[PDB]
Design a protein around this ligand. Structure first.
Ligand SMILES: Nc1ncnc2c1ncn2[C@@H]1O[C@H](COP(=O)(O)OC(=O)[C@@H](N)CC(=O)O)[C@@H](O)[C@H]1O
Ligand SMILES: Nc1ncnc2c1ncn2[C@@H]1O[C@H](COP(=O)(O)OP(=O)(O)OP(=O)(O)O)[C@@H](O)[C@H]1O
Ligand SMILES: [Mg+2]
Ligand SMILES: [Mg+2]
Ligand SMILES: [Mg+2]
Lengths: 438, 438
């Protein structure tokens, strides 16, 4: 390997030892009798210091020839010194140019000249050379790990369900159709039917983290046509609050991992990520509509709360409860899918919920209707043909436990966690109405 | 929740304490003075013992009404006794019937009546109720976790890249075209182009575990049209051996994790999983052809090693070097993709390798050609159009370090690890030339 240590891995114990560092030329300063070369790697910059009397002359004359973003590797001696910005410098013995950069760069890695989002996405490899962008994707990786670790510690088994499918769906919208040899198929929008089917398997506690595909017809700052969904389903529950409790602890775990493990990245983003305060507040749909009504926002009882309503409620919950995260629940049954269980005692409302983070939905879930005949009737109530869901209904006939679950958008989670304005900031290569490349 | 403990979670410590167990009805003995009920959960069977003298008369009467595969929950007292074949029994206080099963069942969960693979695939929720099937999918989840943990321990950051793309990632054959609104697009055969682009970002060490899609024309025991690929790319390498070293370590780690954490599943499968022996043998393509020729299997230099050749080599390596896992490397450049670096001093061969597990390819990879102009010429040598790869080529112009990586098939790995005859055994809902549903 051309390096032994990243910038962040050199500590005082290495003082006076030889190391190899490598990265991209950040800055060269030829100051006469001394020259400086700064190299950027994933973790930051490292100072290479070349005093004329202390380095090989060919090294001395090479440094000024180095150009911005050239890829280089340096072998030299670690010298901890107060004179060094970051505590230590490397006195070079060997400098190798691995690969030379072309010279109008697509983006300015110093951030001085700022670029449009479009230009940045078109040139993502350059965009990540900026610490604030790298910080987001380090945090994305952290969130994924924290989520999986939490599932594992709680006895969940990872599953993988198909993305090329030919099943019916409730909405029949936003589908990406595709030919599958002789047959017609579509890309999956959610593993919903599959994870429910597996509740009849004994697996009991499953999760899947995998792409979902929805052909949204218009762009928003909150939607992508390709996204990563964190899906779970869990059996033998008594009510939807057990799913909500799990979900909030999961999200709090992800938040706390980022706070503990990515403080450097948070600092780079000039961002203070709040300590989660559990039980998040629960706000019934009835109460949410009342709050919205008093704000002059109309939503007729029975209809889903729209994007404006979420925004207003998010603001209200922050102002009144200092709560960045809260649940909407006890929705009208008519506003939620046929697979959600109704309150047997008050069937006009159902056991579904949405988790809101800074005024944007990050997850929806609920307890499902596991009783076959009631489920069938609910499909009918939606004006749909139960026969079209046969392959799924079949799993409810041979011993199906009560169950519930959620779908948690990874991009939504990260965008909202970091209070970023656009979801395109938290996925490397966005797909939207007009973006298909890179 | 309806349960507090799985069957596997009840130990001596809990003797005399109250627990809740739940699962599917496995057997009932309806006797005059006593009922015995056995329930099955994800981990095994639990005995419920109900002497008439000891239990609620309503509970005594209920047990004989239960039927195979009914879902039930039982609260009761743990009682360790030599008289229970599993070491303990539950003395029940309350039994709740959660859901009743229909007859006949789609498959026989007792294992007595054998079913064909197609029938089993059509009814996976039933199929997993058998311990030998559950065992595979528990092992699948363990393998994913082990792989991720190893990547993390070794400083790799998880990435996520598009599965809807404008340019085929692995070439013209075995490709799913798909319309993306007005545009022509395809499903990703691999994340190859993206993981390379990210080598110009500073991320340096990335992995992605995600679906890949290949429209295979033929139906075989070792191909699917949808699969999970474990991809990695790593920068600042000096040669492809560094990548092979990392891969064998990764695979060894996965195998040892299954050995350590899934012994019970290996037992159920009546399977001895061998302790990995690093380093695996490295066999050059030239030497492989010598070995085969010595065996009377003649492959003209430059041609692919066919499945027969793989089988013969696997057996030889198992016999000669006691190695279930070995690498083939230094392949003919003509037989490998444009993105592989040729040996500069011997251009007919290239820095590509395959990892073979019990005579079947489970991974391929290599050092990439990171030098822009040479890369372009290689795209041309393959008869392709460099302009179709502009977003990818752009990344090689502004400081690109040397790099290399691999794609490791999750299904291939698990199938070969457990010496299973058919790749459909290791993914819940396989997609092949003839299978699109469920
Ligand atoms: N049809 C299939 N069914 C089941 N599994 C499959 C199928 N096709 C591939 N795989 C698996 O993914 C690995 C890499 O794919 P390759 O085409 O060899 O290389 C590539 O795709 C490169 N980009 C990898 C690299 O150079 O990094 C295989 O070894 C295998 O287990
Ligand atoms: N087009 C998308 N882009 C990114 N994430 C999405 C998208 N569609 C759904 N998700 C997300 O997956 C989750 C569960 O899926 P769900 O069907 O409930 O979404 P949704 O109700 O349609 O979301 P929304 O109202 O914002 O369009 C969401 O709560 C969210 O985080
Ligand atoms: Mg939507
Ligand atoms: Mg919504
Ligand atoms: Mg929703």
């Amino acid at each position: 390997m051309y390096r032994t240590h990243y910038s962040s891995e050199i500590t005082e114990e290495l003082n006076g030892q030889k190391v190899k560092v490598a990265g991209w030329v950040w800055e060269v300063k030829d100051l006469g009798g001394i020259k400086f070369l700064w190299i950027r790697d994933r973790d930051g910059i490292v100072q290479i210091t070349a005093p004329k009397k202390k380095v090989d002359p060919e090294l001395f004359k090479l440094i000024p020839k180095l150009r911005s973003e050239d890829v280089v590797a340096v072998e030299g001696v670690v010298n901890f010194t107060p004179k060094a910005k970051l505590g230590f410098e490397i006195l070079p013995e060997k400098i190798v140019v691995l690969n030379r950069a072309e010279t109008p760069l697509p983006l300015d890695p110093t951030g001085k000249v700022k670029a449009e989002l479009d230009t940045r996405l078109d040139n993502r490899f350059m965009d990540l050379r900026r610490p604030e962008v790298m910080a987001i994707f380090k945090i994305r990786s952290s969130v994924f790990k924290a989520v999986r670790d939490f599932f594992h510690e709680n006895g969940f088994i990872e599953i993988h369900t198909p993305k090329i499918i030919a099943t019916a769906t409730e909405g029949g919208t936003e589908l990406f159709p595709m030919k599958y040899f002789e047959e017609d198929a579509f890309l999956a929008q959610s593993p919903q039917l599959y994870k429910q089917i597996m509740m009849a398997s004994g697996l009991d506690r499953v999760y899947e983290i995998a792409p979902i595909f929805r052909a949204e017809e218009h762009n928003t700052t909150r939607h992508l046509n390709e996204a990563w969904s964190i899906d779970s389903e869990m059996a033998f529950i008594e009510d939807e609050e057990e799913v909500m409790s799990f979900l909030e602890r999961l999200v709090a775990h992800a938040i706390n991992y980022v706070r503990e493990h990515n403080a450097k990245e948070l600092d780079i983003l000039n961002f203070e990520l709040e300590e989660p305060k559990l039980p998040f507040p629960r706000v019934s749909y009835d109460k949410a509509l009342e709050i919205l009504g008093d704000l002059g926002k109309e939503i007729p009882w029975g209809e889903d709360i729209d994007t404006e309503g979420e925004r207003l409620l998010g603001k209200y919950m922050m102002e009144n409860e200092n709560a960045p995260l809260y649940f909407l629940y006890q929705y009208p049954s008519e506003a939620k899918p046929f697979y959600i269980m109704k309150y047997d005692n008050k069937p006009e409302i159902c056991r579904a919920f949405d988790l809101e983070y800074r005024g944007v939905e990050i997850s929806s879930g609920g307890q499902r209707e596991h009783r076959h005949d009631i489920l069938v009737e609910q499909i009918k109530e939606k004006g749909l043909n139960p026969e079209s869901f046969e392959f799924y209904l079949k799993a409810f006939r041979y011993g199906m436990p009560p169950h519930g679950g959620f779908g948690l958008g990874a991009e939504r989670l990260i965008k909202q966690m970091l209070d970023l304005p656009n979801i395109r900031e938290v996925i490397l290569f966005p797909r939207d109405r007009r973006r298909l490349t890179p």
